[PDB]
Amino acid sequence: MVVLMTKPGTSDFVWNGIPLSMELNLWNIKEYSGSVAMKFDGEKITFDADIQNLSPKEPERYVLGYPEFYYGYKPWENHTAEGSKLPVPVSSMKSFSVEVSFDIHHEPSLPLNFAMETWLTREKYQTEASIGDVEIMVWFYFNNLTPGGEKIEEFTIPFVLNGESVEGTWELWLAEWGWDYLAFRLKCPVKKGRVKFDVRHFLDAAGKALSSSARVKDFEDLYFTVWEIGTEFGSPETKSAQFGWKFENFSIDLEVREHHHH
Amino acid sequence: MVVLMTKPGTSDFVWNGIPLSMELNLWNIKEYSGSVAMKFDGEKITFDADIQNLSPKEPERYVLGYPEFYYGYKPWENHTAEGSKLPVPVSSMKSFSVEVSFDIHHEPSLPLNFAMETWLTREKYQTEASIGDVEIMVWFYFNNLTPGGEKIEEFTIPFVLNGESVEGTWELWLAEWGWDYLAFRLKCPVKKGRVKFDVRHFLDAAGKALSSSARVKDFEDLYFTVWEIGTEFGSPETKSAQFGWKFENFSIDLEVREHHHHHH
Ligand SMILES: [Br-]
Ligand SMILES: [Br-]
Ligand SMILES: [Br-]
Ligand SMILES: [Br-]
Ligand SMILES: [Br-]
Ligand SMILES: [Br-]
Ligand SMILES: [Br-]
């Protein structure tokens, strides 16, 4: 299964029996010159960009794009690969373990992160996120890039790094924009390696942080729609972007609480 | 050569052609029960503690002990293993690279660090440290423990981590006690791995930080007496300690400055 993209768009693929979507996502790019290439070869997914003459569509949104791949339904795209077990309500999720090997390369000054995210929505199949909805980001890497909003808390969350169980300190950045923006940023970023973690830990911390919010009142009743894996890049000042990534050894294990458990 | 200790004290040993001293150091423990064991087997050095009924000698000093090994002369113990190249004046040191593989294990609540250190003295073989002398610690790991004094600066200092060159951010903690206490703490602690770094880089940052000191007058003229490698542990509320460590693949490389003979 060789799936290749050289311009913005979305393609579905199957990796280790998991149905997924790849998105060469340049959402906030107005214009550009150069090259972009996304490829899935059956064993791995890679992305490379060597783009110039950049301008943002909306300078206030800061980042330029998010080349990624995802499991589940992405609301902003009205899209899901066939056979995905997502969306599921947050209350029915016992655990959601994600495993991936990664390598991030970039031109040194480039604002960039290695971020994973979900959209928590009131309705199962929304086409946007608004007041009452949540965007939860998990940053494993960052370079000359700070999350949006303000740092409100710090959480200790375990994960497996290169087969070793480690306790990470995750900064929580909150913003009350069109929707609720929550970004958990690892204090000690990792550019390459293999990580294994349970998304449930980030859902617990986010529910606890939103426990006094007048906007997100029924946290556990929201639908966990997707799990996106990619790199946000750029700033309103970025005119040239040279970077890429490689993802390998990918696996997801979703545990849903049902009547036969216990 | 097998070196084994099961109570506080010192023993000399030779590792990969390097003369060293091991110290089962419980310096601030007034009393204890349970087991302590330090061992060198030719290839590695290990320590294990399963101690209870702990009480400090001086509660104000906070930590309970520092089981360690060292290269050179430790002033407080008036001791050196035969054949060490230290003490040397700081000005003479071009480079002092240290390499070690380490694994620290401990009960989760235990106050503990993986800290390396030197004592910078005015005279070559002092028996203690006082005003004008410096204590410089390098913390690669910490658990439920903060260095003494206050955070006065942050420094970018490179090191090799698991064969990859990295640039650590180190907090500098400074305290004006009986001597000057300086502690460089890695913002991103590592309890297991392989590290290679140059002590000269920490001395350069310690020299800058102490540039306008009324106590420390001439940094480069002081003697670099020792390089201690161990784990500080405990607190005045610590009643029992369960932890251990293992150190392997140890090497040091001292590069001294060359002299040019003047005829006057
Ligand atoms: Br295409
Ligand atoms: Br690059
Ligand atoms: Br961390
Ligand atoms: Br997991
Ligand atoms: Br233990
Ligand atoms: Br660091
Ligand atoms: Br180095």
Compare all CA atoms of chain A with the CA of B186 and give the residue at the minimum distance.
Answer: A188
Resolution, Å (one decimal): 2.4
Range B1-264: architecture per CATH: Sandwich (2.60)
CB distance A188–B188 less than 8 Å? Answer: yes
Domain ranges, ordered by start, for chain A? 1-262
Cα–Cα distance list, B236 to A57, B36, B65 (Å): 59, 19, 11
Q: What's the B160 CA to ligand 7 centre distance in angstroms?
A: 6
Q: Which residues of A touch B188 (CB under 8 A)?
A: 187-188
State the DSSP code for A237: T
- 3 state DSSP class of A59: helix
A 10 A CB-CB count for B181 gives: 18
Cα(B64)–Cα(B239) distance, rounded to whole angstroms? 10
Compare all CA atoms of chain B with the CA of A187 and give the residue at the minimum distance.
Answer: B188
Q: What's the B141 CA to ligand 6 centre distance in angstroms?
A: 11
**Pairing mode, if any, of strands B18-24 and B29-40?**
unpaired
Cα(A58)–Cα(A75) distance, rounded to whole angstroms? 20
- Does A164 touch chain B if contact means CB atoms closer than 8 Å? yes
Cα torsion at A62, A67, A73, A79 (round to 10°)? 100
Place of tokens 């000690």: A188
What is the distance of C-alpha B82 from the center of its chain? 20
Q: Which residues of A touch B187 (CB under 8 A)?
A: 187-188
A 10 A CB-CB count for A206 gives: 23
Q: Please answer whether residues A207 and A222 qualify as being in contact, where contact means their C-beta atoms are separated by less than 8 angstroms.
A: no
Cα(B223)–Cα(B91) distance, rounded to whole angstroms? 9
- 3-state DSSP of chain B: CCEEECCCEEEEEEECCEEEEEEECCCCEEEEEEEEEEEECCCEEEEEEEEEEEEECCHHHCCCECCEEEEEEEHHHCEECCCCCCCEEHHHEEEEEEEEEEEEEECCCCCEEEEEEEEEECCCCCCCCCECEEEEEEEEEEECCCCCCEEEEEEEEEEEECCEEEEEEEEEEEEECCCEEEEEEECCCCCEEEEEEEHHHHHHHHHHHCCCCCCCCCHHHCEECEEEEECCECCCCCCCEEEEEEEEEEEEEEEECCCCCCCC
Yes or no: is domain A1-262 CATH 3.30.470.20?
no
Mutation site, A142, A162, A167, A186, interface B, largest B CB count within 10 A: A167
Cα(A77)–Cα(A126) distance, rounded to whole angstroms? 10
Cα(A26)–Cα(A54) distance, rounded to whole angstroms? 11
Q: A108 CA to chain B: closest CA distance, Å?
A: 14
Q: What's the A231 CA to ligand 4 centre distance in angstroms?
A: 22
Which residues does B257 contact at the CB level (< 8 Å), separation at least 6? B91, B92, B93, B94
Nearest ligand, measured from the Cα of A141: 3
CA atoms within 13 A on the CB side of A209: 25
Nearest-by-Cβ selection for A164 from B187, B188, B192: B192
Judged by CB atoms within 8 Å, which residues 172-201 of A form the interface with B? Answer: 187-188
State the DSSP code for A172: E
Nearest CA to A192 among A249, A151, A146? A249
- 3 state DSSP class of A57: coil
Cα(A101)–Cα(A183) distance, rounded to whole angstroms? 21
**Pairing mode, if any, of strands B88-89 and B180-186?**
unpaired
